[PDB]
Design an enzyme around this catalytic site. Structure first.
Site, short mmCIF file in Angstrom:
data_model
loop_
_atom_site.label_atom_id
_atom_site.label_comp_id
_atom_site.label_asym_id
_atom_site.label_seq_id
_atom_site.Cartn_x
_atom_site.Cartn_y
_atom_site.Cartn_z
N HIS A 146 55.56 14.04 8.21
CA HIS A 146 55.58 15.50 8.33
C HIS A 146 55.97 15.83 9.77
CE1 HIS A 146 54.38 19.68 7.24
NE2 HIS A 146 54.23 19.75 8.55
N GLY A 147 57.14 16.43 9.94
CA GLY A 147 57.63 16.81 11.25
C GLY A 147 57.49 18.30 11.50
N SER A 148 57.28 18.65 12.76
CA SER A 148 57.12 20.04 13.15
C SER A 148 57.43 20.16 14.64
CB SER A 148 55.72 20.55 12.83
OG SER A 148 55.68 21.97 12.83
N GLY B 55 47.75 23.60 16.70
CA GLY B 55 47.15 24.22 15.53
C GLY B 55 46.95 23.24 14.39
N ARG C 197 48.01 23.41 7.07
CA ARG C 197 47.56 24.51 6.23
C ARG C 197 48.66 24.96 5.27
NH1 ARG C 197 45.98 28.73 10.67
NH2 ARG C 197 47.49 27.50 11.88
N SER D 259 61.99 14.30 8.09
CA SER D 259 60.90 14.99 8.75
C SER D 259 61.19 15.23 10.23
CB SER D 259 59.60 14.20 8.58
OG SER D 259 58.99 14.47 7.33
N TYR E 66 62.77 18.58 11.47
CA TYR E 66 61.95 19.77 11.69
C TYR E 66 61.21 19.76 13.02
CZ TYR E 66 62.98 20.77 6.83
OH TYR E 66 63.63 21.05 5.65
N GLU F 129 61.01 14.86 -1.67
CA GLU F 129 60.02 15.75 -1.08
C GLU F 129 58.72 15.62 -1.86
OE1 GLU F 129 61.17 19.79 -0.60
OE2 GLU F 129 63.06 19.33 0.43
#
Ligand code: 25I
Length: 350
Positions: free
Chosen positions: A201-203, A210, A217, A243, A246, A327
């Protein structure tokens, strides 16, 4: 002066970078004067989600170009943008409404980061790094490069970089074993479920203060479900490059962060095209978006009882799919147990 390991301190330093938060808002053309970082609020963001949902139906069922004008202008009233003395652009189509919903997703996670910095106490005798580390309520340990966890994880990064994303390659800088407070409590009903996989999971970096504090979330009810391909859930991938996209790194910002979480997929409801669903069909625990390419199912190995799909990319034998790669979406936040956090150096050949 902190006693934490140097990688952990450098991770905290950028997790709580105020200048990076201000820059991310500037990236979204947000007016930092009429909308300062200190005046970010869940109440304001939720209202913007709500007006963005107003533009959703009017775009969906075809409204006249001047009926959209009031709803579009309505959104800029709540979230002030910097356009000087000319009109902001019209939000007349479905691509412009998901780009403004992606901004609200990050504004919500940026608000949490700044809320931690301004809340609580200050103690000039204490290290700011040590203080901000305690606000995450997360135990962060440095994984040994010489260890067995690092070998499996490096192979995961090495093998699951898609050819389509060959404009860069990934160099693992640091591996962190993370344990969120009370998360293992939350993961108990799905602890021994079937189809438990270690997924990516990339962000953006400005999202991780957060994520480590509140967890991965799901969008609030006011967010337009039309923006998310498979509905409002937590999205994962088995290809590291998918991922890593992102993280939104660049040549002037080549350091990114990615997660490795244990996701209880269970009986996956497999799909090939968009499906803005709200609930799941009975008996399903997750949604899998079928991709054109999948990791080798015979190269699966187990890390602490969890399946790692670090196999080389091969054809999935699925025709007429809208996805090049897989996904994975779960719709209960209790099905995610975050396990690892990686510091990635993006080497762009662009
Ligand atoms: O998980 C997601 C999510 C992420 C993506 C993009 C994406 N990214 N990264 C990946 O590795 C990845 C891998 C495969 C597919 C896609 C992705 C697409 C829709 C998604 F639903 N979220 C939405 C934003 N968001 N906002 C909040 C809150 F609570 F702050 F409001 N929670 C969230 C959680």
């Amino acid at each position: 002066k902190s006693k934490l390991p140097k990688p952990v301190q450098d991770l905290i330093k950028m997790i709580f970078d105020v200048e990076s938060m201000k820059k991310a808002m500037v990236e979204y053309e947000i007016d930092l004067q009429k909308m300062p970082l200190g005046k970010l609020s869940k109440r304001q963001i939720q209202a913007a989600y709500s007006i963005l949902s107003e533009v959703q139906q009017a775009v969906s069922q075809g409204s006249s170009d001047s009926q959209i004008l009031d709803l579009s202008n309505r959104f800029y009233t709540l979230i002030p943008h910097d356009f000087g003395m000319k009109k902001p652009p019209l939000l007349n189509n479905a691509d412009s409404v998901q780009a403004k919903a992606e901004m609200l997703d990050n504004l919500l996670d940026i608000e949490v980061a700044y809320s931690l910095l301004r809340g609580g106490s200050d103690d000039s005798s204490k290290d700011p790094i040590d203080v901000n580390y305690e606000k995450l309520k997360t135990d962060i340990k440095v994984v040994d490069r010489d260890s067995e966890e690092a070998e499996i994880i490096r192979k995961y990064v090495k093998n699951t970089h898609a050819t389509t994303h060959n404009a860069y390659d990934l160099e693992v800088i640091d591996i962190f074993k993370i344990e969120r407070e009370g998360e293992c409590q939350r993961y108990k009903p799905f602890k021994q479920l079937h189809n438990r996989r270690l997924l990516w999971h990339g962000s953006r970096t400005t999202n991780f203060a957060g994520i480590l504090s509140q967890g991965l979330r799901i969008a609030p009810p006011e967010a337009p479900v039309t923006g998310y391909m498979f509905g409002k859930g937590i999205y994962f991938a088995d290809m590291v490059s998918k991922s890593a996209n992102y993280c939104h790194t660049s040549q002037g910002d080549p350091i990114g962060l990615i997660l490795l979480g244990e996701v209880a997929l269970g009986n996956m409801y497999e799909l090939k095209h968009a499906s803005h669903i709200s609930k799941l069909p009975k008996g399903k625990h997750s949604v899998k978006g079928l991709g054109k390419t999948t990791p080798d199912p015979s190269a699966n190995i187990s890390l602490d009882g969890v399946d790692v799909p670090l196999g080389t990319g091969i054809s999935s034998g699925v025709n007429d799919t809208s996805l090049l790669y897989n996904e994975y979406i779960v719709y209960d936040i209790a099905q995610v147990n975050l396990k690892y956090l990686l510091k990635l150096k993006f080497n762009f050949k662009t």
